[PDB]
From a paper:
The first enzyme in the pathway, peptide O-xylosyltransferase (XT, EC 2.4.2.26), catalyzes the transfer of xylose from uridine diphosphate (UDP)-α-D-xylose onto serine and thus determines the site(s) of GAG attachment on the core protein. [name] and XT2 are type II transmembrane proteins consisting of a short amino-terminal region facing the cytosol, a single transmembrane helix, a stem region required for Golgi localization (Schön et al., 2006), a catalytic GT-A domain (Lairson et al., 2008, Müller et al., 2006), and a unique C-terminal domain of unknown function, termed “Xylo_C” in the Pfam database (Finn et al., 2008). [name] has a two-lobed structure, with one lobe comprising the catalytic GT-A domain and the other comprising the Xylo_C domain. To better understand the initial step of GAG biosynthesis, we have determined crystal structures of human [name] complexed with UDP-xylose and various PG-derived acceptor peptides.
To visualize how the different amino acid substitutions are accommodated in the peptide binding cleft, we selected five variants of the [name]-derived peptide for structure analysis (peptides 3–7). The +2 position exhibited an unexpected preference for the β-branched amino acid valine (and, to a lesser extent, threonine). This induces a kink in the peptide, pulling the glutamic acid side chain at position −2 out of the binding site and replacing it with that of the glutamic acid at position −3.
Residue numbers in the entry:
A (entry chain B): 211 to 219
B (entry chain A): 253 to 309, 312 to 728, 733 to 959
The structure:
């Protein structure tokens, strides 16, 4: 489930 | 000077106000105005892949057992930072083979780790270090610049004929042998291994901030505004840990087509670039049909613990990080659902047991009688970096620890004649190590110089200091432990300030650890060295809570001495713990002056720690304020030189114990052991992290 490290602002 | 264009973007104005350097404000304005005119970013890009979409080209665990006739040779690129040089040496030992290649990039800010890596590159012909060094902050655009430059460097190293490109950090570790790795890649040498999110791609774009313009400067990622995704190509991404074959690396490096050119411009101003750059280029290039949707890694995501927006002060964005593996995770490395050869993260200061279990499982146990297998040493100060890289706090306390060791040497020798173990300190500490045994913090190891007064000769010694237990429990409640510290790591649930070293201008945090049980409400109380009650508050312990913490707003400076923190349950005592606010003997690395000591060691500038007062609770908690010791605290606050050193060493000795002290070279103290012959010294044998000659099979392990 490696969906990138970014969450949001 | 004024900008080249009117700057009205709310995001750019916010970054211009927070940037400190003049060079940074200028570069921000220049970037903003270029984008305003449409001269910075591309808006349409050519797609060369013939496929109408993505390809994504049966896992049998027995297929990695054959012997290749034409095995691949691998170029490992290690991007490392921090202090954990002995763990990096252990992992390097596990992955090394004489036929592979190793190219190491050390963060510009980690000079200690760099000096240690240099010693490795000097021993082996197939190990080199990058001459250039960037500050690869989290999410920074510079990480892609690092990879792309190393790819150019490696392609131009004619004498290194490599077939695959693998990137690893100091927190990675193999979960399969090198033999199996070579066998697997030798069968699929024309494939590229990258893992995609596989979910909604529009949500991936937004959460990664790909539609936002970023600029890296002053070791920060500034968000400058919005931007359009280029038309005519598919955008994709996922993990920034991958394996790429030489054919594709050659294309990314030397191609001048519309796709590679515009993507290098687009991703020079992108957050987390390495998490989508290589995916996007591959899927729109002529090599699109070589992509396998698997990076051959196991990444320990735990978004219930690892997504606390812990990089808010480094990047204008919130993100996540993977957790550290623990012993209960060992079975996950034995899955047979898909092929996997590496995993992350591992941290020896967090848990070394799982590292040892994994390494012995792959290459067997060390011979009987091997020392240091359950220990760990980590250097946290090295003399070549200078006392100005320390703080006035750590410099003061490291000095005190050395004097606490000298007093142990003197009292250890029992004689009625001249004491040949009396020493006089000289200079500053030469190095400091953290020391762990079986995943339990043991304290600090300080190497220092001193004059043996009986023979009048200079000696080099190392002292081991351990903190005294201070947690005390007073009806089976849920509380298991309580502690005070700074630099609380929410992902790993521990203080990174391992020693709990604190000075008058520090802002301490209180932590409580709980077990299972129904919800309860408790009361916390902070008490200063002369029984002044600084803060009181109640906290709700929910039935699912495991750790709680809070940082009370205390007016500075804190009165030096031993503080106490109590936990009550409706006035019923529960537990208590203590921590030390040490007075400082240094100001800007120079001896502190009276006028300076007075303002720093006499308590809060506002005469109290908070607006709200708690003088009403002193008689209720049996904490009377002795009028005498209040005045003796005034006298202490005015002392410097010898008097101040005596006050400090008195407080340190009450909270720390000098466990042992050894000599590195010849000594005149008849009762001092040689450090190399002890079990605890950083000079003692540590073969699991030591690197020697290459064996007949081409291995070090
Ligand atoms: Na070398």
């Amino acid at each position: 489930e490696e969906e990138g490290s970014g969450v949001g602002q | 000077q004024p900008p080249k264009c009117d700057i009205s973007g709310k995001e750019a104005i916010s970054a211009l106000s927070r940037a400190k350097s003049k060079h940074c404000r200028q570069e921000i304005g220049e970037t903003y105005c270029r984008h305003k005119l449409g001269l910075l970013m591309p808006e349409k890009v050519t797609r060369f892949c013939p496929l109408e979409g993505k390809a994504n080209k049966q896992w049998d665990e027995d297929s990695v057992e054959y012997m290749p006739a034409n095995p691949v040779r691998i170029a490992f690129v290690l991007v490392v930072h921090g202090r954990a040089s002995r763990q990096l040496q252990r992992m390097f030992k596990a992955i090394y083979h004489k036929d592979h290649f190793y190219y190491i990039h050390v963060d510009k800010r980690s000079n200690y780790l760099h000096r240690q890596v240099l010693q490795v590159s000097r021993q082996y012909s197939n190990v080199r270090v990058t001459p250039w060094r960037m500050a690869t902050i989290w999410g920074g655009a510079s990480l892609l610049s690092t990879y792309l430059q190393s790819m150019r460097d490696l392609l131009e190293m004619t004498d290194w004929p490599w077939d695959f490109f693998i990137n690893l950090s100091a927190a990675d570790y193999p979960i399969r042998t090198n033999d199996q790795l070579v066998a697997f890649l030798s069968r699929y040498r024309d494939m590229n291994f990258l893992k995609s999110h596989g979910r909604d791609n529009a949500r991936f774009i937004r959460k990664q901030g790909l539609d936002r313009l970023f600029l890296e400067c002053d070791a920060h990622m500034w968000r400058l505004g919005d931007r359009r995704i280029p038309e005519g190509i598919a955008v994709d991404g996922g993990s920034d840990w991958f394996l790429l074959n030489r054919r594709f690396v050659e294309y990314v490096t030397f191609s001048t087509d519309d796709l590679v050119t515009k993507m290098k411009q687009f991703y020079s101003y992108t957050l987390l670039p390495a998490e989508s750059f290589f995916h996007t280029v591959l899927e729109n290039s002529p090599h699109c049909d070589t992509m396998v949707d698997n990076n051959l890694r196991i990444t320990n995501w735990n978004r219930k613990l690892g997504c606390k927006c812990q990089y808010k002060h480094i990047v204008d964005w919130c993100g996540c990080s993977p957790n550290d593996f623990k012993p209960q995770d060992f079975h996950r490395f034995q899955q047979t659902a898909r092929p996997t050869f590496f995993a992350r993260k591992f941290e020896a200061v967090v848990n070394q047991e799982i590292i040892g279990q994994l390494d012995y499982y792959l290459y067997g146990n060390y011979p009987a009688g091997t020392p240091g297998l359950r220990s760990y040493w980590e250097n946290v100060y090295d003399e070549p970096d200078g006392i100005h890289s320390l703080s006035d706090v750590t410099l003061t306390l490291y000095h005190s620890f050395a004097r606490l060791g000298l007093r142990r040497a003197e009292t250890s020798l029992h004689t009625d004649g001249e004491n040949s173990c009396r020493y006089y300190p000289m200079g500053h500490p030469a190095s400091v190590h953290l020391y762990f045994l079986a995943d339990r913090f043991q304290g600090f190891l300080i190497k220092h110089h001193a004059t043996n007064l009986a023979v009048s000769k200079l000696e080099t010694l190392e002292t081991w200091v351990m903190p005294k237990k201070v947690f005390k429990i007073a009806d089976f409640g849920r509380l298991q432990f309580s502690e005070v510290g700074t630099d609380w790591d929410a992902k790993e649930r521990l203080f990174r300030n391992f020693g709990g070293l604190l000075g008058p201008m520090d802002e301490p945090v209180g932590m409580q650890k709980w077990g299972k049980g129904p919800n309860v409400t408790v009361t916390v109380i902070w008490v200063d060295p002369v029984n002044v009650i600084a803060a009181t508050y109640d906290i709700l312990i929910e039935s699912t809570a495991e750790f709680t913490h809070y940082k009370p707003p205390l007016n500075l400076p804190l009165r030096p001495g031993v503080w106490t923190v109590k936990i009550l349950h409706h006035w019923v005592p529960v537990a208590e713990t203590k921590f030390l606010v040490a007075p400082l003997t240094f100001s800007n690395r120079q001896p502190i002056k009276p006028e300076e000591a007075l303002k720093l060691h006499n308590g809060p500038l506002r005469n109290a720690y908070m607006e709200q007062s708690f003088q009403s609770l002193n008689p209720v908690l049996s904490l009377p304020i002795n009028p005498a010791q209040v005045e003796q605290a005034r006298r202490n606050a005015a002392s410097t030189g010898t008097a101040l050193e005596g006050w400090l060493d008195s407080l340190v000795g009450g909270m720390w114990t000098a466990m042992d002290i050894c000599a590195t070279g010849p000594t005149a103290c008849p009762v001092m052991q040689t450090c190399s012959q002890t079990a605890w010294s950083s000079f003692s044998p540590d073969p699991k992290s030591e690197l020697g000659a290459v064996k007949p099979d081409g291995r070090l392990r």
